[PDB]
Design a protein around this ligand. Structure first.
Ligand SMILES: COc1cc2c(cc1Oc1ccc(C(=O)O)cc1)[C@@](C)(CC(=O)Nc1nccs1)NCC2
Lengths: 92, 479
């Protein structure tokens, strides 16, 4: 059910950094456990990952620095609503 | 003298804080005389590596919003969060962290109404729009720049988030700002326009220096200053109420719509922001909402009103005229406007009329085909606010009339303090218009049942487009 999204403006994409968005009523404790489970699964496969930030207050989820190869795996994690590749914003 | 932009937002009659304005931009020169002592730099940094110059953009916007001499809301309290680097570049992730920081600050130390200015843009982002929805649902007002790409604002974020206030840029001649090859963004995602060309404001070069800047960032800063003033005067305003007031008090039909691409002319609001005439009885506020194009598909388009708004009427439009009309229908105990495409039709737009009508539980009265189809609002204190019509086959006061082969839908509202009148106007032409008189609000706009492309309300004017043709307008006012 989880979907993947990346910026439609190719020069604005920042691959390697993903925002993992969890289901609406997910708790901060569950978000943290989902991030650690992802890091554990990634390690068992030989990939280095970095949890840059865990979100709470607005949307549940976290920010991860990792190879795109883990996206299929990350989409299978519990509570995942969608994943979005990071992208650039500019002063208007 | 007085900067042109400050004079432009000054109403034709004028009687001339508890609100904080958060700015998400570059670093700022907090000691500039225009803003000194009124700007709190959080020093929260979430900027990507760079692949006076650094504070240029942010300092100028803090000045536009609250500056002592050239500001919109003179003296307003401001908080800045750095999310853009020295080249004015940031990330969706860094923007999300800043927005989250605002919610967390507010949870730890509540204050009064909050206005968040986001003078930045990236491509359409699901997560950025969802974050804006959650911040708005938490009771925060978000004002954003439509973008400087001379493109449809719907393809950009936060510009496209339904719950924000998206601001386009206009110049001294009330024309859309051109930024060289590019310029202001436009379309159905823009709420209104504001001065965004040659805007004098604080320059980071020195503490008393001033620079003129242009863009949708400057335009959005004007609206955050207006919103902050409106919220200081009426602090109980919800977001729906504040958006309706900005649209009501705007200068209408001053923009030459010929500057916008053909298909964007109808969808783009012809409004230039202005301060209200007084701080301030009860008036009926309505606005038009255009849906996304259905597609070429049996294709349908859906237009809905924001939370706290009532949908009073529903119309549809097709450039080719290949449509099957529209219907108003209940969904989650709320009226929605659904438009239908026809065989070989490129697609349709659903156009809703959204109004602030508290405790009015606007219902639909539907009659399928059976003299012409008829339905009526027969209840004490009930007014007819709109008529819709749809056909499932190609090719009197308080009463709706439709074609013999079409279903008719009437929006009936419980509003005893409301007086409504139906004003019809037919000419023996590519466009027929009819306007509600001054002091009356257009609640509904339709074509009387040779071939119509569609109907849509433009402020208080009903517009019917054809390939006798009669434009029918329902006008209401507080009695
Ligand atoms: C992505 O589409 C829009 C984006 C933006 C807007 C309207 C949009 O037009 C629809 C159409 C249908 C629907 C819908 O059916 O949900 C939502 C927005 C405005 C003009 C604000 C607005 O009126 N917001 C609204 N929220 C709720 C209903 S209207 N400026 C912000 C960006």
């Amino acid at each position: 059910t989880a979907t993947f999204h990346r910026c439609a403006k190719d020069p604005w994409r920042l691959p390697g950094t993903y925002v993992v968005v969890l289901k609406e009523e997910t708790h901060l404790s569950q978000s943290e456990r989902t991030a650690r489970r992802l890091q554990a699964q990634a390690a068992r496969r030989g990939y280095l990952t970095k949890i840059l930030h865990v979100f709470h207050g607005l949307l549940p989820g976290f920010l991860v620095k990792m190879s795109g190869d883990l996206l299929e795996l990350a989409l299978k994690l519990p509570h995942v609503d969608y994943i979005e590749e990071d992208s650039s914003v500019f002063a208007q």
